[PDB]
C-alpha cells in the first residue's frame, strides 16, 4: 500500500498495456522491446553520463541470442539503462 | 512523462527515502534490504505460489557472499520474488 506498491503494480498496467492485444503466450521479442526502450527509456536518455553503458545495452538487445526475451530480461535491462547514470540520484 | 515515469522515479524517491539519513556511501547490507523486503513485498506476499522461489530468496539475500549489496541487486531481487509468482497479470 505504500508509495511504491503503487508504482509496482503500474509497471505491470504498462507492460500489459503494450500487450494486451493478445498476450496468448508470455514472452516479448528484442526487436519489440528495444521499441518500449524508444518510448519508455527516451525521458531519462537525458539524464546519462557512461554512454558506453547504454551502446553496449542497444547491443545485448540486438544480440539477444536467444529468439524471445523474457520479462525477468525486461526488468535487468531496464535497470542497467536506469543504473548506467552512476549515482543518479544526484538530479541536476 | 508517461505514467511509467512517474513510477520510475518515484522508485528513487523511496529507495532514498530509507537512505536519506546520511547516503554517504551507495551501498545497501543485505540485513537492511531484507528488512526493506518485510515492508515492500509484504503485500504482494498474499499473491505468490512459488513458495520454493521466494524460499531460495531468502536464502540468497542471506548468502550475500558479497559484505556489500548495490542497488543492481535491489532490482534483481525485487524482480525475482516479484516475478516469483508466474502469471502475475491473473490478479484474482
Redesign the interface.
Known sequence: ????????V?????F?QYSGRE?DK?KLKKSELKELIN??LS??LEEIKEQEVVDKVMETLDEDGDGECD??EF??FV??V??ACH???EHE
Chains 1, 2 share one sequence.
Open positions: 500500500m505504500s508509495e511504491l506498491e503503487k508504482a509496482m503500474a509497471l505491470i498496467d504498462v500489459h498476450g508470455h518510448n519508455e525521458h531519462f520479462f525477468q526488468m535487468a535497470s542497467m536506469t543504473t549515482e543518479f540520484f
